[PDB]
Amino acid sequence: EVIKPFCVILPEIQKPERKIQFKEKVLWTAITLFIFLVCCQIPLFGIMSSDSADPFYWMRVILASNRGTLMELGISPIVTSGLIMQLLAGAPKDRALFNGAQKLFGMIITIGQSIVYVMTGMYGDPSEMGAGICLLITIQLFVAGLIVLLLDELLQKGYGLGSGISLFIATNICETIVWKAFSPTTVNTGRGMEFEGAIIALFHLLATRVRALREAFYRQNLPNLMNLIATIFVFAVVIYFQGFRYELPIRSTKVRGQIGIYPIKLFYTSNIPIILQSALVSNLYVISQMLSARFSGNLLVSLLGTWSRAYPVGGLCYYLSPPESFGSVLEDPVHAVVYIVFMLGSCAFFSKTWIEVSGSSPRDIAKQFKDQGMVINGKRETSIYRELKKIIPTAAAFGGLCIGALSVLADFLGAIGSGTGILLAVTIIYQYFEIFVKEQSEV
Amino acid sequence: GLKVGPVPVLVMSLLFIASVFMLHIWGKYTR
Amino acid sequence: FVEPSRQFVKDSIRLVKRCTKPDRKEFQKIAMATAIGFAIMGFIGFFVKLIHIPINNIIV
Ligand SMILES: CC1(C)[C@@H](N(O)C(=O)Nc2ccc(Cl)cc2)N(c2ccc(Cl)cc2)C(=O)N1CC(=O)N/N=C/C=C/c1ccc([N+](=O)[O-])o1
């Protein structure tokens, strides 16, 4: 109860009594993502140097972060606070208190992570900075996290289509893909002035100079056109598999006469297997890198991963890492097989565990059907859970397996954005599209 | 609990961005 | 290990057989919506970054 006095001292977005139509929701979602994008390009003040290694390079994709800028914590405070409060709950006014505690724990996590980032050695030496510079960075990150929570609450309360977390993750992934496809940034080595952007390179190479096509396609130091082709192909395949669904014909027994279709998608858990697997792997990368930086030489740290951008060469983090290129696959086929097996198994296991946990289990769906009077069209009321026990577990496990296979395919093909990134982007965009079609069908 | 809307949130975000920029310009012109 | 795997494969094949594959029209609609959303997000981010690179260089 002592949280409640501190829960009220934080702003809350005004809940719109009248529902907003799709056009204004899309416009405000665009405004929110534009604000986030502007914030993630503005560097912090007081940063002495950014020439050091980046401790959390593996979190910058799943947490929608950006090193050295305002959006450096990204969405980590929101996810951490939400998970903490969900674990506490598992262990009107009630929802207002819940949201206030969400905000309070988000600010606490933001302060803690800002202190950790300041003391971990980046931005320069914390001791040489002084109290003023480190403190100013702390307020900058605190206000940035407050703004992220405000935007997320705006989206959740209704001025936006979905949630801040998914929107920011998808926006960062899409921005990365478009930048690697169209970057005007140029890098020189001696062959000539070459654009980093894959498509920009093609126009530049042809105008500057048949070989040009080979240089633009089979290039190995900057984004390629074959990488973009792989990205487009993975987009198309993930879209095709996302469109998969199982259509149960359900009837109604309470209101005599009401017919509908209950869809059980192939991607039953959506991108949750990808989110869980990628979060686990990235946290393992960060932990292994930090342990190998400090306690280098210990056998346990060596087994957790030996690093060489630092990429693993041996250990658990190495066997959990996608092959660097095709030559990596040929040189170490055992690593490729182990990584494929780990990806598929982890994705399937996470999918089935998530349907058991979240509340989409066949027993829970049968209970929901019983609460609403819905019965399958031909199956008797007795066979409502069984016809769900024959679909939902298999659908969840196979959706996890397929989404893991798509991630492996994207990683092997060399896709810009990577398997996780691309899969997260497609799943989030499809969530927005399905919200759109739901709103249209309601009208 | 101070309740605000979407436009006030946008204004607050833009003014925070402006404040960070003014801090940066202050540093640049005092160096 | 063998029988559970065979059962899982059979169930997966049965489910894929009974799923409702996206038709051309449905696939075209989903692809168009995904392309529009990706274009919006990625190009807004790209333009923001492209504007802020000169601004970042000027300020710092
Ligand atoms: C929080 C954290 C992120 C970490 N963690 O906690 C952190 O912080 N870390 C840090 C802190 C501070 C600093 Cl300064 C730095 C770092 N972790 C962990 C784990 C395990 C262990 Cl054992 C530990 C931990 C965890 O998990 N986490 C998370 C991760 O990783 N990821 N996430 C992702 C999500 C996504 C999503 C959501 C939703 C969505 N949608 O889409 O809707 O999507």
CB contact burial A357-381 (16+ within 10 A = b; e otherwise): eeebbbebbbeebeeeebbbeeeee
Task: Please tell me what resolution, in angstroms, this structure has.
Answer: 3.2
> Ligand 1 mean position to A404 CA, how many Å?
20
Q: Measured on CA atoms in the order A443, B5, B11, B17, is the torsion positive or negative?
A: negative
Q: How far apart are CA A223 and CA A57, in angstroms?
A: 19
Q: What is the Cα–Cα distance from A350 to A272, expressed in whole angstroms?
A: 8
- Pick the closest to residue A67 from A120, A123, A112 (CA basis): A123
Q: Are A427 and A242 a contacting pair, CB within 8 Å?
A: yes
Residue identified by tokens 């989206």 is A155
Domain segments of chain A: what residues? 1-181+225-443
Chain A residues close to B21, C-beta within 8 Å: 42
With beta carbons less than 8 A apart as the criterion, state whether A31 and B10 touch. yes
For residue A178, give the nearest of C20, C33, C42 by CB distance. Answer: C42
Residue B13 Rama label (left phi>0; alpha psi -120 to 50; beta):
alpha
Q: Is the dihedral of CA A122, A124, A126, A127 positive or negative?
A: positive
Q: Are strands A193-195 and A186-188 parallel, antiparallel or unpaired?
A: antiparallel
**Method of elucidation:** cryo-EM
Ligand 1 centroid–CA A79 distance in Å is: 6
Q: In this complex, do C60 and B24 lie within 8 Å of one another by their Cβ atoms?
A: yes
- DSSP SS3 for A360: coil
Q: How far is B18 from chain A (nearest CA, A)?
A: 10
The answer to whether A369 and A384 are in contact (CB under 8 A) is yes
Question: Closest Cα to residue A416, out of A243, A163, A182, A191?
Answer: A182
Q: Which of residues 1-60 of C touch A (CB under 8 A)?
A: 8, 11-12, 14-16, 18-22, 26-27, 30-31, 33-34, 37-38, 40-46, 48-50, 52, 56, 60
Give B19 Cα–ligand 1 centroid separation in angstroms. Answer: 29
Which chain A residue lies closest to B23 (C-alpha atoms)? A45
Cβ–Cβ contact A42 with C under 8 A: yes
With beta carbons under 8 A apart, name residues in chain A contacting B2. 11-12
Contact of B9 with chain C, judged by CB distance below 8 Å, is answered with no
Distances (CA, A) of A156 to A111, A164, A286: 23, 8, 30
Q: Whose CA is nearest to atom 24 of ligand 1?
A: A283
Are A311 and A321 spatial neighbours (Cβ–Cβ below 8 Å)?
yes
Q: Where exactly are the structural domains of chain B?
A: 1-31
Separation between Cα atoms, residue A213 and residue A267, nearest integer Å? 38
End-to-end CA distance of chain A: 43
* Residue among A96, A94, A135 at smallest CA distance from A118: A135
Judged by a CB distance cut-off of 8 A, whether residue A364 touches chain B is no
Count other C-beta atoms under 10 Å from residue A291's C-beta.
16
Interface check for A239 against chain C (CB to CB < 8 A): the answer is yes
Cα–ligand 1 centroid distance for A61 (angstroms): 12
A126/C14 Cα distance (integer angstroms): 60
Confirm or reject contact between B16 and chain A (CB < 8 A). Answer: yes
A184: chain C residues, CB-CB within 8 Å: 50
- Alpha-carbon distance C3 to nearest alpha carbon in chain A (angstroms): 15
DSSP symbols for A20-85: PPHHHHHHHHHHHHHHHHHHHTSBPSS-----S--TTTTTTTTS---TTBGGGSTTHHHHHHHHHH
For atom 42 of ligand 1, the residue with the nearest CA is A166
Size of interface A-C (CB pairs under 8 A): 111
